[PDB]
Every structure is written in structure tokens, then in C-alpha cells.
Scaffold this active site. Sequence first.
Site, short mmCIF file in Angstrom:
data_model
loop_
_atom_site.label_atom_id
_atom_site.label_comp_id
_atom_site.label_asym_id
_atom_site.label_seq_id
_atom_site.Cartn_x
_atom_site.Cartn_y
_atom_site.Cartn_z
CG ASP A 137 -51.11 -96.05 30.11
OD1 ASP A 137 -52.04 -96.28 29.30
OD2 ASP A 137 -51.29 -95.45 31.19
NE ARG A 141 -54.88 -92.57 29.54
CZ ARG A 141 -54.99 -93.54 28.65
NH1 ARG A 141 -55.94 -93.53 27.72
NH2 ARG A 141 -54.13 -94.56 28.68
CG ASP A 155 -49.07 -91.79 33.05
OD1 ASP A 155 -48.60 -92.55 33.92
OD2 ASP A 155 -50.26 -91.40 33.06
#
Length: 317
Positions: A137, A141, A155
Site C-alpha cells: 500500500d 497517502r 500504514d
Amino acid sequence: EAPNQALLRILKETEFKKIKVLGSGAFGTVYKGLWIPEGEKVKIPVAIKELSPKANKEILDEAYVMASVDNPHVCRLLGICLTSTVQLIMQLMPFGSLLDYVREHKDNIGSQYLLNWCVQIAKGMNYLEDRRLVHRDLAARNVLVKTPQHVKITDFGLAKLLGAAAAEYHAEGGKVPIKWMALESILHRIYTHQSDVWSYGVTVWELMTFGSKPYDGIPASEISSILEKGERLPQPPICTIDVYMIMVKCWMIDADSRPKFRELIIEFSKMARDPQRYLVIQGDERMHLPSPDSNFYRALMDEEDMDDVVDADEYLI
Ligand SMILES: C=CC(=O)Nc1cccc(Oc2nc(Nc3ccc(N4CCN(C)CC4)cc3OC)ncc2Cl)c1
């Protein structure tokens, strides 16, 4: 194959205080707060992630991954608190996500910062590959800003430790962001470090366009067909062909033909030597970013006595 002797620290709820909500959603709520280890005379700015049985398991899997990594360009897990709602205590990254940062400060971001961010992200990803961890991921972001000069990857909700003698992770059914995924991950749910390289390329494209949405206006269902025809993200206006070629190489169909993270460090490090030769930004030379002392933390934590404030990177076990 080697034993993972990382230490998982259990924190008492009374030795940290929530100060303000930073983000809220289905995943949970992240609080800005102070961690005060009793008897140490230090105050550590922290982000507190507060999470149902399936949600409690995924929280602990994320804690397992973060507790197993230690690199200046990967976010630091300080510990967990075993309340009725399990809480993850992480290092506070006071400037937020890099995606929001490039959008907010677009007019003051020069080529030196952009190329340095590319180096630091590549260093962090190369460390994860050394740890046999696939992030799955990577995006602007999920890169956090400690200072304008220092970013870290975070994350690890999708991150998978490659088991012994495994070259790839085979997912099944989990919702995934298609627009950052390698083509072989879209078609076959196959994830490798080279699939992370593809996501690295999209991340660089996000930075070089100052936070544009990739394949904007296109539904995710059409994305896989677009990539199969050979279409890719366009060349950002500020990017020389030197920089754009690196991004294109991250998007090769042959995953083994994509650059390695250790090579992305080298190439972007060369460009960071002479940043205006590789990114063309008007007014680049006269741009300035804050990079703040004790006065910075008094306002950030809404508290006057910040004499004993210590960043997590200087608080070692
Ligand atoms: C996945 C969805 C999501 O939004 N997750 C999220 C949200 C907020 C914080 C967050 O985690 C962290 N955030 C930070 N820093 C940080 C992030 C966002 C913000 N902002 C504040 C302004 N605005 C509300 C947007 C979010 C501010 C931050 O420091 C003051 N540092 C460490 C961590 Cl672990 C994750």
C-alpha cells in the site's frame, strides 16, 4: 528464517494523554497525544490509533509488523495499550501526510525537497525489502512528514512478511487500491518487492504533480484494461525526461525489468546533487519551508512546559 527478537512494549493507559483528534473514519480514530513514561522525565509526542474481534486481530497484526522494523525512514511503533479498545502508540509526524503536504505547500516546494523525498522513500522501501516485507500500500497517502526534510513510510495494514522461501504474497479478496497496484497484482493478486516498485513509481508521480489523482476521473474497473494496452501516467510538467524515464521503468510489465529500490536510491541521489538539472520549477531557488525548537512543541501539544519534550527517534529502549 531468522528469529524475530523484536520487543513488543505494553504501555499503561495512564501514562499518555489524548489531546486532539487527527483523523476519524471506519478504520478508527487517530489522536495526537503525549506519552509520559513514568519516572523518566520525558514527554514524547505520539499518535494514538484506537480500533469487534476481527478488528482487534488486524490491529495486532499491524503492531507485529511495526514492532519488527527499525529504520530512519519507516514509522516507529512505540508500543500498544491493552484497553477494552486496543490502542497503537506511534511517533507523532506533526506535518501530516506527504500527499496533503505537497498539495498545501505546492508554491514553496522546490526540486531539492522532491528529489530528497524520493531518496528517503526508496531508502525506507529498500530496508523493508531487506526485512523481506512487502508493503502492498505504498502511496503518497502513506508517507508521513516528520519535518519537511525527513519523511517516513507508514500504514502497514496490508503489509505482509514474506514467509521463509517465499518470493511473493498471494492475496485473496481483500479490498485494494487499484490505481497504485502493479498489473500482475491487479490480474493475479501477486505481490512482490517489485510490485512495491510499481507503487513507488505512482508515488513519485503524485509528488511530481504536487498531489494529482492518478488516472483521475477513471473508474477503477477500467484501470487494468488501460494498463494492458500500454497506457501509463503522463509526464509531469516539471519532470525532465531523466526523471520520467525512471517512473516509466517502475511501470514495466516484466516485474524483473523494473528498477530495484537500491538502484532508485542511487539514481535519485545523483539527481539530488544538481536538482534544478532534473526538475524545472519556476521560482525554485527562492522557496523556503519552515522546519521548526521549544516554541514549536508548545503550540503543537497545547501545553506550555515542553522542557522535557523528546522526539521518539531520540528515545531508545
Ligand atoms: C487511513 C486514513 C487516515 O486518515 N489515517 C490517519 C489519520 C490521521 C493520522 C494518522 O496517523 C498519524 N498521523 C500523524 N501526523 C498527522 C497526520 C494528519 C494530520 N492532519 C491534521 C489536519 N487535517 C485534519 C488532516 C490530518 C496531522 C498530523 O499531525 C499533526 N503522525 C503519526 C501518525 Cl501514525 C492516520
